Design a protein around this ligand. Sequence first.
Ligand code: HEM
Ligand code: HEM
Ligand code: HEM
Length: 71
Amino acid sequence: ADDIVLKAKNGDVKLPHKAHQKAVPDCKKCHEKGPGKIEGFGKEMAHGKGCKGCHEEMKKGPTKCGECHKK
Ligand code: HEM
Ligand code: HEM
Ligand code: HEM
């Protein structure tokens, strides 16, 4: 499903793409060059300007280790 499970032996990080596709009608802040693969993103990113950045910037998403990584 939309859910785009990433890689992380520390606990997959189910990213409600769909939900995120609704909460962030602007498929740009997440998609640079455009909708699809992203060049630059990674781990640190998610832990910052990528997933958390918005989470900590917006204060809606998960912003804790036990708020993303869920075995
Ligand atoms: C907004 C409605 C929106 C669309 C449309 C969209 C499309 C899209 C595509 C086509 C892909 C590639 C997968 C494929 O080729 O089938 C993709 C992948 C990712 N997206 Fe996205 N996306 C939309 C919105 C958003 C938003 C708002 C975010 C972030 C909050 C986001 C994130 C991602 C991520 C991450 C991926 C895969 C890259 C990865 O790191 O694994 N999308 N999306
Ligand atoms: C980056 C790949 C990324 C991940 C991973 C991620 C995860 C995530 C989860 C698991 C939730 C929980 C919400 C739920 O009920 O499923 C969540 C919530 C929100 N996030 Fe997020 N998120 C990633 C990226 C981004 C980015 C880049 C933004 C903003 C640009 C963003 C925002 C939000 C919002 C908003 C929510 C909560 C919904 C709302 O209050 O509207 N996420 N995220
Ligand atoms: C909290 C401070 C926190 C820690 C610590 C942490 C650790 C961590 C590790 C060690 C990895 C690498 C995976 C491995 O070792 O195999 C990793 C990767 C990702 N994480 Fe994380 N993580 C912490 C918090 C968060 C939060 C709150 C989120 C979601 C907003 C998150 C997400 C991710 C993602 C995504 C990855 C992998 C990168 C990718 O491209 O998917 N982390 N984290």
